[PDB]
């Protein structure tokens, strides 16, 4: 095949140029992100039953929808929750790779079956099916620099001028708004209402009558009378536009002719639609947009558009308005991508340096160095062809490939150089002679190396998505490398090299190379003699191998396990949960202390704090709060004590002293889509109908057990809410009939005053906005305020609520949760420092087994993927080993040689296990990729010996011992040079400590340690395996 391109070297260069420009074109157009779409798609169903308690909401809404949701294709698990506000959120998670649009359609089809069974007010409120994720792409905060506008004043400007543009910006999927659009608030006062003998029903009726839009037809409309000469529309009542217009709404006229206006009985002002959530930025009033990335969109492309969009509305800002970015993932993505690119460049330079040590020639070492850019760019073109995107996982693939793809070009020039030393043949004739001895070695090594990475691409789950990224990159690199080796290297070796005199071994040089060559040759002779002695006593060394295999198995079970390493993303969360029934003011007091601590004790690291009051991952509630914490640039946070893991440990330690509040600081998970916090996600399931009371006791019992193991479990907490006291008011309808008061009036008066009521819409600066009627704050705070409200009887009298009602206190859960249709309570926690999530996973299962019968458990979120990854790990190795064995046999149709080759696999695996154990790493997704790389690399070193040894017997007729000793003698230098090229190739990953180094260290350490033992042990045991196996068969 090289002979087709030796005659026409221009054709070889033309081929290389095409691959070069194909990669360059691909780079300029490929999408860029940190990770691919590896998180499983999720669909969220949102419904509302205003005013109903959590237990009532669950029975009439959640159960109705859930019972129809079974039987949906590719459904992994389903979870739901309902709270005291009447909100319903049912989340369905599908298998990874499932089409989100098809899944959303199927969910929407099933919803129509349960839609008629829901309450009418639920149907009128509207139930929405939406593709959802728990991770924000970025958070764009808006603050006022002089404090002249309140939170709702800021929120409306964001809602009116920004939300519409942002929500329809390219690639934007969802926009949560931290605040509310302006709404006309009618703060009624019961005392003046009672003075004029009015009721909230009268206020609502008057607003609807006087604030309405009425169609009135046209003048001379069709069919017109003959001779009509004018056509014009008639304009009836229109929506009110100002608070003054609302203020002078006429309610009733007194007997003396006086007019009772709306402003005489209520305060009229522009306020928010709801006041449940309060957001502050560094202790300053603020709002913002919780932008979420659409499924299938690019993180970098959308954020650049969003930042460009924000600069567009900047000229239209009111005075004092400022934009801030408390949360932004793009700086982390860019810095992580660049570090691997920096690592990639260092690998090429180091690979160039080590080869120059051996070849000691500028021109000779340049020929194989030219190959690397061609194939490296070629992998980019293959990525574009298959529809992949540039990411850290693909970035790691080329970095790992660096030690592999150069091996084919390394050994070719070695043979050509060796031919010159042995015979002084001209470079073109030496090149032609070289191929006939080497072609099998090049394809065989490339074929088996690509073979081991093929089965990994066929596995499912989020782990399989990670595996595919390494699969496409490495396999395509190997395929292109052997293509380039046959295409490009023979041409330059025949044109760009220079002859080396026959018999030249380089011992006579005066430079450092002279010392290196003489020492290298002398050490080789001693090594060969040692191998010869070993081959005479192979019985001893078989026992050593069996010890190694036993040791490898012992280390594999001793090594802890995990899913994915944590990273310093520059941001972390702190959650605050006050006891049951805590008001909004009390939670704000705790959040002020939390914000004050970060800005004083951690002013060196914390850039800004963005806190919410009334909202959290445990659900909406005045007693729940959460705060984003933004850290400075990684360049400005040197050392380990300034990292997220250290900061959160100190923050949690300090916040433990805070009384009457539970505060936890945690890092974000490895990927933000699969969960809200790092650690394990544990679900406790009632599988027999134990009820809420018994299930809560089991949850408390489990938490007590976890609290007794602080050495391996930390920050163990429930994700739900404790049972809150409830104010129950009973309306005696029999007394209502006696007093002559309509029941609907009683319900309307109670609902509108205390819970607030949405009447209709109004126009505010050309935008449609809601109108709300509610009691003033000071008249709806205590149970004694119930008697302050009156209902007008049919006879015209005013009667208070106390004359026909009674009140009492009850207890009930403010939030109920279900898992897969069964009642459940969610438990969160983290592994103690030094331990791993897998150990926490193992311990939690043991503790859960002690719970009373009828209570089960299941893992979800990150933990579910953690469990799934471990389960299919044995199948990944078993299939990969089988594939390589069959692939090796295909080269010879003999079983002895592939069996001899696979005997070195434990020699490499033990190196990866030892390296991980000494550094304290864990068996995770990255480590599993390292093992498969080590398996291929260990076989590759063996092939360099077996292939040569096999030829010397079948082609030159040398003896078994003679061929093995001879083939080992020449092949030591290619093995050492290729092994070292891999050692320094992945060394930057091992020594990396910057941003994103957690992933790099996990990948680099396993392959580096494995390759060391795959080189030191192999050069002795591989001759033992080959000799013994061929002696037996």
Residue numbers in the entry: 1 to 1033
Authors' account:
As part of tripartite multidrug efflux systems in Gram-negative bacteria, they span the entire cell envelope and export a broad variety of structurally and chemically unrelated toxic substrates. During drug efflux, AcrB undergoes a functional rotation where each of the three protomers sequentially cycles through the conformational states loose (L), tight (T) and open (O). Substrates can enter the PD through several channels and bind to the access pocket (AP) in the L state and the deep binding pocket (DBP) in the T state.
To elucidate the conformation of AcrB without the crystallisation bias, we assessed the structure of the variants by cryo-EM. Indeed, our structural models of the best resolved O monomer densities show that the DBP remains partially open in V612F/W structure. We assume that the O state conformation is still feasible due to compensating interactions, such as the PC1 and PC2 subdomain proximity, and PN1 subdomain interaction with the neighbouring protomer. However, in the L state, such stabilising contacts are far less pronounced.
